[PDB]
């Protein structure tokens, strides 16, 4: 199917501290493969997936230099943004950046992205055509002006359509065992009486990959979207994900409800029904 | 592989 590579950066100013905090992580689809933490002892990009450990010394030294450069650029940005918003050095602020690329089934470029945020909200983002910017407010217009004058988009576009996709393909191949896989969900249902007239039916999906999944409940043929309690898909810690969906039903009517599970690792959607 | 040239905001 389609794939993606994405890098996520978090920059946090720390008043009274010698240095702000900087954390970078890289992902291919839903699998993390690298990380950097400015506070850590090594001061290098580190592997977080087995298939990337294959990369040689030149790869790691190069990624380390580039991430340390990202760190320095972000250290400066913290001060710049405080200026644009005329904020004091007393408070801690956050900058986040995400960029990457998506490829299709043929593994060819489908789309690129580069988004930037300040204090949890959009600040500036590269549009889909990868030629122009969308500025969220007055302050971001200064950044937009600066980036247009320096022809930032043209250079960035080249990375997203070339380097980004080329390395994603390399990772997809080198990490085929891990990345080019699908683990179908292991499903089951639980029952808990809420009272003497009502009970909770919880549908479970476990050990699946990728994270994309759809759990839905039905009462004899019809959707229960509104009355369904759904939790966020969560990581198991072993590389797979988990999720559940529940409904409260009248004692004695359990058999009328059905849980439907949709996932790419399944040849056909699954339908579960409770049985005493 | 990371982007190489990053421009300050």
């Amino acid at each position, epitope marked *: 199917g389609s794939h993606s590579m994405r890098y996520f950066f978090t920059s946090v100013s720390r008043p009274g501290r010698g240095e702000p905090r900087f954390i970078a992580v890289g992902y291919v689809d839903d699998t993390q493969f690298v990380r950097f933490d400015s506070d850590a002892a090594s001061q290098r990009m580190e592997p977080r997936a087995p298939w990337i450990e294959q990369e040689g010394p030149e790869y790691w030294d*190069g990624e380390t230099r580039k991430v340390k450069a990202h760190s320095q650029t972000h*250290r400066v940005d913290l001060g710049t943004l405080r200026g644009y918003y005329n904020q004091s050095e007393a408070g801690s602020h956050t900058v986040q950046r995400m960029y990457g690329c998506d490829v299709g089934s043929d593994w060819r470029f489908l789309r690129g992205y580069h988004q930037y945020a300040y204090d949890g909200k959009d600040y500036i983002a590269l549009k889909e055509d990868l030629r122009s910017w969308t500025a969220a407010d007055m302050a971001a217009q200064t950044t937009k002006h600066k980036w247009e004058a320096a022809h930032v988009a043209e*250079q960035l576009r080249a990375y997203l359509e070339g*380097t980004c996709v080329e390395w994603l393909r390399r990772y997809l191949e080198n990490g085929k065992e891990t990345l080019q896989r699908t683990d179908a969900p292991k499903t089951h249902m639980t029952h808990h009486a809420v009272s003497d007239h009502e009970a909770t039916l919880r549908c479970w999906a476990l050990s699946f990959y990728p994270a994309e999944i759809t759990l839905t409940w039905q009462r004899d043929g019809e959707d229960q979207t509104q009355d369904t309690e759904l939790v966020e898909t969560r990581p198991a810690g072993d590389g797979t994900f988990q999720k559940w969906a529940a409904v409260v039903v009248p004692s004695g009517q359990e058999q009328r409800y059905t849980c439907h599970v949709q996932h790419e690792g399944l040849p056909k959607p699954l339908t579960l029904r409770w049985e005493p | 592989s990371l982007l190489m040239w990053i*421009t300050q905001c």
Partner: T-cell receptor
Framework: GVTQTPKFQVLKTGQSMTLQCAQD?????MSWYRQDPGMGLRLIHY???????DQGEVPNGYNVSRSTTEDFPLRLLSAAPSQTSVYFC????????????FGEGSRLTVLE | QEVTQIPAALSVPEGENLVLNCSFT??????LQWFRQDPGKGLTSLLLIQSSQREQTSGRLNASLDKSSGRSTLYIAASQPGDSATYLCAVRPTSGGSYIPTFGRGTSLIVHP
């Protein structure tokens, strides 16, 4: 801009010395060069940010450090006649136009 | 990965339009920069051409970039004696993660009054 010092310096073999380079443009990239007749500009050391420095083409006999954004001092622990040369500090963003900004240059003569 | 400037020396009568050449072996560059240096003096930047741009102009100076052919040409119109100096060409990589520039040896130019 870029300000490096001293502009001229005489040293006796074995003496230590440190050339200073400071920039106020918030440049992440800073570097040191030595330029010699028939040798062109040769990179000694460079740094893409605080807490990181890397060797250039001719690092032997030179030491650098990048504790701050603004400064990138070049230190000669034990000056040798072979280090007589003209030194240039150059800085730039690791983005934007990527344009290099050179300091005025420091002339160093090491004598026995 | 290699920058060359040929001819390495140029002698011209004041007033003529001149051309300085720059060539590089690796087309994957982030920018190309032209400088001038007088003997015993420092390096003054003249023009910076980003990899996505074709040319830059400043006064009597104009430089073009042909990334695909691995070359750049620096044009100086109505040359003056004061243009006498060594002109240096440098480029930086678009990828790799070193950021290190590659300099050419330079072309020594003499404009005779």
């Amino acid at each position: 801009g870029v300000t490096q010092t001293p502009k001229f310096q005489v040293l006796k073999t074995g003496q230590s010395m440190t050339l200073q380079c400071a920039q106020d443009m918030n440049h992440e990239y800073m570097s040191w060069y030595r330029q010699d007749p028939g040798m062109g500009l040769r990179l000694i050391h460079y740094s893409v940010g605080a807490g990181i420095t890397d060797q250039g083409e001719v690092p032997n006999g030179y030491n650098v450090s990048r504790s701050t954004t603004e400064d990138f001092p070049l230190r000669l622990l034990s000056a040798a006649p072979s280090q007589t040369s003209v030194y240039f500090c150059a800085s730039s963003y690791v983005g934007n136009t990527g344009e290099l900004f050179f300091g005025e240059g420091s002339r160093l003569t090491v004598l026995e | 990965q290699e920058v060359t400037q040929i001819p390495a020396a140029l002698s011209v009568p004041e007033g003529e339009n001149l051309v300085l050449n720059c060539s590089f072996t690796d087309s994957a560059i982030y920018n190309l920069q032209w400088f001038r240096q007088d003997p015993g003096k420092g390096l003054t930047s003249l023009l910076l051409i980003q990899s996505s741009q074709r040319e830059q102009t400043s006064g009597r100076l104009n430089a073009s970039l042909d990334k695909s052919s691995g070359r750049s040409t620096l044009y100086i119109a109505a040359s003056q004696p004061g243009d006498s100096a060594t002109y240096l060409c440098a480029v930086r990589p678009t990828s790799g993660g070193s950021y290190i520039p590659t300099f050419g040896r330079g072309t020594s130019l003499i404009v005779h009054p």
